[PDB]
Every structure is written in structure tokens, then in C-alpha cells.
RNA sequence: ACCCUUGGUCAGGUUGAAGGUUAGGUAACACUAACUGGAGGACCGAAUCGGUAAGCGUUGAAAAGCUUUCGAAUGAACUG
RNA sequence: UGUAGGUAUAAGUAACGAUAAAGGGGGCGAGAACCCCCCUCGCCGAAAGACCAAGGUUUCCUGAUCAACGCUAAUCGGAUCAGGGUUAGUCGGGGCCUAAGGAUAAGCCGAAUGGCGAUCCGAUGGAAGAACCGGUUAAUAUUCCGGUACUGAUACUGGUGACGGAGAAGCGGGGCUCCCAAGAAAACCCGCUGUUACCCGUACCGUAAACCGACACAGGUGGUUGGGUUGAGUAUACUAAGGCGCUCGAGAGAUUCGCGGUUAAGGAACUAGGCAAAAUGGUCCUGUAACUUCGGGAGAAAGGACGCCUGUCAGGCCGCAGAAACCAGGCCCAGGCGACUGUUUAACAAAAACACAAGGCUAUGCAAAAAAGCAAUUUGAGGUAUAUAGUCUGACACCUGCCCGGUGCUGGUAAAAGCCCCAGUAAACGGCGCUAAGGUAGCGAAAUUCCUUGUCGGGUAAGUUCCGACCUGCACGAAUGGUGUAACGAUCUGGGCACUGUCUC
RNA sequence: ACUAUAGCUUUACAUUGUAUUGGAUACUAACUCGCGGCGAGGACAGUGUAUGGUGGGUAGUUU
RNA sequence: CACUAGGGUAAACCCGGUGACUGGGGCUAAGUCGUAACAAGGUAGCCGUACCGGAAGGUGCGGCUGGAAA
């Protein structure tokens, strides 16, 4: 759900933010969590690298498993956790082996329910099970691309995909960005959409809460001078010309991906 | 109003003392011409 | 100038968001009144940060200041 | 406009560095406005008093000295010379631990010099194993001494550490609550009767005459404390403790300047412009319009009371004046621009410029695209299309028309790309007069109009500015956005009331 | 504007092999990547030399 | 000293008037452009709603017969 402010100052007018309905925990577990610095954009020779980074809030990283190899072991979910390191929630787990782990929060998982992950788990939400093993059809996310390597496909907040059909080893899913692409059956998915599907109709307000993000303002380059960009200079307003970047790489519609990739034999249709 | 010299034990000895002149190729070229122009003070670690 | 890590500072007053409780009200939620609550790049204003306007200074007390006036002052704040 | 050294001229001139301020009596001395003692006067007193840190480095105390230094003199000095002065088992630091970062191992990269790369270094953080009272010096004191004490050595694999912001609360006599932006690491620590006590600092200045500013410079400099009356207050005024009268004076009282005070009658006639000044100002009680995004506008505007005494709000008393001094919003009507709080040309521009929350387009399926680097490698991000990046627009409301012809972009030779051709793309650049299409809505003498002080209406005695209309728009126009818009502005611009040396003068 | 050039891109040779049916398909052993040998790719990709495009991103200049 | 008619002040309300400019409507003739409806009026008509056009109007979606032909 979403909370609207109230219009009591004009940077409340029009800010919206979450309602925090699903969060039944406000500490982390401690032995999963540390303190993370922060970067400037800085690489590791000082040099700026990204720009617009800097600043916002401190941080603790928490230990996400995204490979979920404890077959066979059920866990019990205890605790759905803000984490501020994604825009969707966690949810701590308890193995009966006496073992803790944070994973991403499915929608639709309620504390005091049971997870397992390998062949013979079953296809309820919150499971993790090889490719090979999910019904065709199935909502899913969290999907590996190579099998042991960790789920990385499906992630952010009210995502999900689809596995629409299987061809042997393997098997064809549509992502959230309309590709449509082949994945290798036993890599690993898990059952449900990612929750918090709330998150896009958050809205600001305010440049300070940018700032708190840790986001830093980003300048046009048609207020710059020739000096700095390309599309900078002149006498009163111009429209810059063509849309370039610094290096003056253009803006609208040309391609960037590698024309060689081997990885196109697996995309069978492609969509941005 | 602030002036430029704004002075820190710690900070004029990292930048300019006799080991941070060592640590580098450049810092013994810098000791090595002062040495052979003569100079009394070798480096700001030589001043008291 | 920007960033990173670790610390510190912000007299006093004002306003009164969410939420809550109590009465009425509904099939039930809603919704009205009182009390409470104490939010905010909220208000007035010292420290502090900045530098609007005028006067003065222009071999100056000062290679950029002083006096009065004026902006911000829990934050995109200031500062070691 | 040559160079070094020396000496002139301006000239016994500017100036002697905050307008907090001095007067007298004694002392010493060759010499006294200034030195020492006393009395009186004045200034600071959330400091101009008292402390810690950085920085300085003997400036600390005493005896001699007055050449130079001290913007005057000096018997004096933060000055010259000599002597003296800093005392720790418990204070501070270090020894221990780790952060950013740095140096490295195994390895990686690379004409060379070298660049990377997980254990070590590295406080601004975490541990430290551990007191006070009193007295004493010219100069040190939790260190010396007298008591009173305490501490450490020595001879008889799961928890803690370990963490945010805001607010309530315990003459006469700590926890708690709420919130979202979700709040270090490691050591460590848990569980599983003598005999000794090492090292470094310790003086002095420290909102300053000792630090940064060439100066004994009206500037800058982190943290703590900061009595009384008045007050909401750490504001303001006065004043204890404590500290100061600011290292040139004396006369005189022209012009003129600087900082202040009063002013008849008039009251913006001043001026580019009400610039500056004047005016407003407190608490409580009444009462508050257009408009609006329903929060606001708003402290709108406009009124009334206020001292002292007596009696359970009334009766009385005094003054020109009861907010008593100091302190302490001027208000209203109407336009342009920019939604708003912010940012900017250190040193002539604070704005309408930048940013902004938000919208669109494009790229990117993860060794992602993109950015640094010769590379290794790093950022992106340990994020994964509700994400990241490039680019334009800039809250919000109603909206955002036509053109793919041009230019971009996307598709289908050495020993194939391209190019062609065709198709697409305008919230791509761009255009909206024979053509690709010949400007839709909405605006319009406008931050755009040359002619031009266009014409008409309002306002004034009189209006090249202003507001409302008209439309032959030199040369508006829809995301280099069009037209509006409550709130906001040390913005630009017009008119009123108040008020006044801005002016008549 | 003239002339270069980093980068990007095309093809040939090298790295680079085998079989079937040449022009494609298939294989694994070069090579690449992932998980702690196994898995996924695969003679492609990447890299070197040569070569044609593009290239105010950068440079030296002229006007 | 209260009480009060009347006076001044401010506001706000109500009732009227006028105003550069800018919009409908009625009536009379008939100048101009078309032919929308009345016949299946030559695309059946009408109702609601939306967009668009020199105008009558056109088109989309749903409804009705107060429509022929069948
Ligand atoms: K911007
Ligand atoms: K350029
Ligand atoms: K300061
Ligand atoms: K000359
Ligand atoms: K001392
Ligand atoms: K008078
Ligand atoms: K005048
Ligand atoms: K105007
Ligand atoms: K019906
Ligand atoms: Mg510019
Ligand atoms: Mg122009
Ligand atoms: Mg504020
Ligand atoms: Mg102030
Ligand atoms: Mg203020
Ligand atoms: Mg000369
Ligand atoms: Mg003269
Ligand atoms: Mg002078
Ligand atoms: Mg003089
Ligand atoms: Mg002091
Ligand atoms: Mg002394
Ligand atoms: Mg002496
Ligand atoms: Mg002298
Ligand atoms: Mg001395
Ligand atoms: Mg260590
Ligand atoms: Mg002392
Ligand atoms: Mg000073
Ligand atoms: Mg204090
Ligand atoms: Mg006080
Ligand atoms: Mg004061
Ligand atoms: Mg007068
Ligand atoms: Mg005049
Ligand atoms: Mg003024
Ligand atoms: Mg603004
Ligand atoms: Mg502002
Ligand atoms: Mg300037
Ligand atoms: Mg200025
Ligand atoms: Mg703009
Ligand atoms: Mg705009
Ligand atoms: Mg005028
Ligand atoms: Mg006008
Ligand atoms: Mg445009
Ligand atoms: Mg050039
Ligand atoms: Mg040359
Ligand atoms: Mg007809
Ligand atoms: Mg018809
Ligand atoms: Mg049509
Ligand atoms: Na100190
Ligand atoms: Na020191
Ligand atoms: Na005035």
C-alpha cells in the first residue's frame, strides 16, 4: 500500500510514499548484516567514474541468498525486514538445521509459513526448484543463469516472469522487459512475483529526499559551455543539436549492444 | 579572513617529510638534487 | 571544488499533519464533535552560516573590510 | 618606463590603527601625561571573565640594561644579557583494536621508471587497570607535602561489544513513544605481609600583542563554562567575581568632512527610483476580504485594554505620556518572470540564470549498457528492466495540431562492410511557403512591435511608465513546451494609506 | 575548411582441429566462461598483423 | 457619571446605474452559399454521448420504431 501526505507544506503536496503494511520486523538480524561504505561514483584510483552519486544515508548490507542450495531442508519464515539495499522487502528464515538466511520477499509469503528449495520441493510460492520441475505456466522469479551461480534475472520490487514453454535442455521464459529468451533447465527459479509492487507509485516530493537516497544533482549540457559538452554553448536558449552524451556517443535509438554477442542464439525475440 | 596557510603537524609531515620523500622514485630525485645543491635543510622534518 | 571515513553543534517562542481515545452514526465500513498527539527541505527569532541595500573606507585598521540593514537558521544545515 | 648603492623633492606635510575616558595624591628617579601604590571616575560582564584542543616554542619568574625594538617619552615591556623555573602507578598520550585510505603476500598487468592485488599500518572512533580533601612557590601542582583511598604485577562455536532522527517523561532608625531516509569495524569481555609500579607531556599565550593574516594589524580560529535583577530567552539594559580604559598628548572650538540629535508651515513637490530616514513594533481580548491546490491567504486588514492604591472586576490616585527606557512586523491594491525550500560568478552581476520533485524519449538480459584506465583492474553494483545509463522538459490544471521532403538515427579494399535503393523515426535536429507540410488551440504593441509616445478606456491638474481592450503578429505559438495558476520571492514593475529634512530651504 | 589520429566496425591470414553431406551440419581436443573434477559453450568468440569504412572524440594547421 | 437622537470613521453586505470592448435572442424583408428534414427525401429517421467541420451537418458506440422493403 501507499500512504499520500497531506498538503500542509509544498514539499508534502505531493509526496507519496509506502505504507510499510507488510514490514513485521524493525531490527535486522545481526549475524547477517555489516556496515557498508559508501562510493562517490569514485573507481579505485579516486577518479570519479559516475557521476550524480553521493552522500544519503548510512547503510548495512544484508547477506541475501541468492543461491538457496540447502536441498531438502524446510525453513520457516519468521520476519518480513526492510532492507534498504532494494526496492523489495526480505524475509529471514530458520532452518531446521539451525541455519539463518535472508531471501527476497515473494508476494504473498506470510510469516509462519514453510519454504524449501531442490527437485522435490513442491510449487508453492517461496520455493526454489530447478527449472526442469516448475509446471509451465508458473509466475516465477529469481532465475539463475547458470546452474549454481545464483539467482540475477528477476529481482526488483513487482517483477516477475513467465515460463511459457520447455524444449528439452532448455527451457523458454518471457522477462519483464518483453524479451523472450531460452534458459538452461536446471538453472534455478523461485515461485511467485517479487512483493512490494507498490514501489513505482512512490513519488518524491522533494529534492531532499533525493539527496537522502543518495542521488546528487544532474546537470543539462545545454546549459554548459562547448568546453564541457558537446551540446553546450550560444547566445540565450539552444536546442543543442543532435542528443549526445560528453563523448558524443547519440541518444535516440542507436544500438549499443555488441553486435557479436554469443548469447543472441538463446534470445529468440528481443524487446527494450 | 581564512589565509591559505592553515598549519597541521600531522598533514605537513605526510606531505613533505623525509619518508614520504623516500617512498617514491621521485621524492629521492627531489633529496638527491637537494643534497647536491647543499642545502641545510634536507627536508620540513630537518626544521624545528 | 567535489567525494570518503569518523566526531560535534543548533537560546527561546509559535503553528498544529498522520495517528489515537471518547461520544453520535451505519447492515458494516465510512463520516461529525471534543480531547490527545507532535509531523514539517513549516513560521518568528539568538548563536552560527551567508552577503541584499545604503553609508563609510579607496598611499584602507583590511591585497575585499567596518557600521546599519537584510536572508537562512532540524536541514539539499553548519562544523572539527 | 635600463640595473645596484647612496642621497634628495613633495615636508616637518599625511599619519601615530576602532570616540570604553579619565582626574588627583604619594613613591622612585638625573629625567615621569604614560612606571609602582592609594582614592575617585569610566568600559565588558553568554565577556573584553574562567577552561580544553590546534598552532607557537621560553614569550613564564627574578636581577641587571634603555643602544636597537615599542608608531611619543619611559625609571616600563611579550625588548637585550645572565640566572632560575615544568616533579604523576591513578591526569593526557603511548603501549592494544580497527575505519576511510595506504603499504604489501600469493598472483595479474606492463618499453623502463612501475600499475594493481587479502595480512600489516593508519584515529577523527572502541578499550584503557586505577581517587579526592587541604596546604605550600617569585615561577609547578589531582604531579611536592599531610590525610584519606584505590589499582596492577611480584616473593610467602553461539552472545556481548554494537551504534539513527524527533518528541514526551523519570534626616530617621536513563529508558519509553513515534517515524522512515532504516542508522561502522575490530580488539575485548562472556558462554560453550612484604617489595615494587616503566616511557613521553606538564612552563607560558591560546575569540589572541605569543596561532593564520609582512605589523604589538578593527579580519579568521574547533570544544566547555558563563553569577544577580529583567525577561519566553544564552535577546535586551544595568551590575558582582574577574578583567580592562584599547602605547602619542595639550590647547582651541573657523571652513569642511565622518558618526549622531532637534526642527515652524507644508508633506514625495525630491529623485531614474520614497534611495536614505521617518513610521510600524509587546501581551491579552474582539474581528478578519478577494482567491484557493481546502493546507492556506492570516499576525490579513480594522479595533479595545495595559501604571499605582484599596475592596470583594469595581472604587479611587498621579502624569504630557503607564508596551513606559533598551528591546520590538509598516500595511493595502494590481501586473511580468520563476511553482515552491535551496544553488551561483572567493574580489563590481543572487537573478528571470542553475538545481528541483515530476513527464517523455532512447539505450541496456547481466563479464549489462555506460564511465575511468596501455592493460590488469575498478566504478555501474554486488544492483538485475518497478533496475541502471544518456538526453530534453521542469510543481500543478487544461492541453500539447500539420510535416519523414533536408540533416541525423534504425532496418532490409587487402589477400565483406560500405555505398545504392526502399521503409521507418519529430516529447529526434528541423520546418509550418513552387510545394514535405503552407500554424490547430491558446495568446498577442508581449522580457518578442521597427514604425511607436500605434489607437481607445481607466487612473492624474497634467501619465513616453502602469493596468484593461483592439489586432496589418517588422519578426508569438504548443515538452529549445502553449496558455493559466493558489502559495512562495533581500526578484522586476505600477498605484494608494501611514510617515517623514528626500525636498520648498 | 585541410590533414592526421584514439575509439568503433568489416574482411583475410595466424591462434585453428576432426567427420559427414562442396555448404552447410555435427563432433571435441585448442580456446572461453560457471560451480566446487563436474557443467555450459566451441574452432566461433577474443587477441596479433594487414585491409576498406567511420571518426571535431582528440591534435597540428590554414583561412 | 451612565442612557440616547444625531454626528464622524472604517469595513463588509444588499439594492441600483454607467463603461472601452465583447456575446446570444426576437422580428422584417430578402442579398449570398448550399440542400439538412418531409417519399426508402435519393446514406431510414430519431435519443444519449464524444470528436470534427463555412453552415445546414458528418462520423464512432449503444438504444428506439415515432421506418420502408422484405
Ligand atoms: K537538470
Ligand atoms: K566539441
Ligand atoms: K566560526
Ligand atoms: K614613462
Ligand atoms: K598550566
Ligand atoms: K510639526
Ligand atoms: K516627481
Ligand atoms: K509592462
Ligand atoms: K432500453
Ligand atoms: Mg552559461
Ligand atoms: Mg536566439
Ligand atoms: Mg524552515
Ligand atoms: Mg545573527
Ligand atoms: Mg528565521
Ligand atoms: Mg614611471
Ligand atoms: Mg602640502
Ligand atoms: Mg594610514
Ligand atoms: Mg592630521
Ligand atoms: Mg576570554
Ligand atoms: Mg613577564
Ligand atoms: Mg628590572
Ligand atoms: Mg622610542
Ligand atoms: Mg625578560
Ligand atoms: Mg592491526
Ligand atoms: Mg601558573
Ligand atoms: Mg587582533
Ligand atoms: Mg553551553
Ligand atoms: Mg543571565
Ligand atoms: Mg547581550
Ligand atoms: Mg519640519
Ligand atoms: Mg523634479
Ligand atoms: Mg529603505
Ligand atoms: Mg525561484
Ligand atoms: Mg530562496
Ligand atoms: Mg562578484
Ligand atoms: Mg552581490
Ligand atoms: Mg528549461
Ligand atoms: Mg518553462
Ligand atoms: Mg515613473
Ligand atoms: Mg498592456
Ligand atoms: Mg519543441
Ligand atoms: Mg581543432
Ligand atoms: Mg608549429
Ligand atoms: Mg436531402
Ligand atoms: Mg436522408
Ligand atoms: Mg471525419
Ligand atoms: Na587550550
Ligand atoms: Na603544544
Ligand atoms: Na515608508
Known sequence: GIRKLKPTTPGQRHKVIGAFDKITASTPEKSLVVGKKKTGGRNNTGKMTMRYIGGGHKQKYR????????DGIPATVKTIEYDPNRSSRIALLYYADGAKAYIIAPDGLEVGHTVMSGSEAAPEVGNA??????????????????????????????SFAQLTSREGTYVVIKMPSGEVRRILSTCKATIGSVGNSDHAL?????????????????????????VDHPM???????????????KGLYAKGLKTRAPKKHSSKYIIERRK | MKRTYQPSNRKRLNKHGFRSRMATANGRRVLAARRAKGRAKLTVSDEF
Do not use: Y
Open chain 1, 63 to 70: 547477506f541475501i541468498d541468492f543461491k538457496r542450495t540447502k
Open chain 1, 129 to 158: 526448484l530447478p527449472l526442469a520441475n516448475i509446471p509451465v505456466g508458473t509466475i516465477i522469479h529469481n532465475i539463475e543463469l547458470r546452474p549454481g551461480q545464483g539467482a540475477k534475472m528477476v529481482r526488483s520490487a513487482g
Open chain 1, 202 to 226: 512512490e513519488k518524491s516530493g522533494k529534492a531532499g529526499r533525493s539527496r537522502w537516497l543518495g542521488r546528487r544533482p544532474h546537470n543539462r549540457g545545454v546549459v554548459m559551455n562547448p
Open chain 1, 232 to 246: 553546450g554553448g550560444g547566445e540565450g536558449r539552444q536546442s543543442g543539436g543532435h542528443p549526445r552524451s560528453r
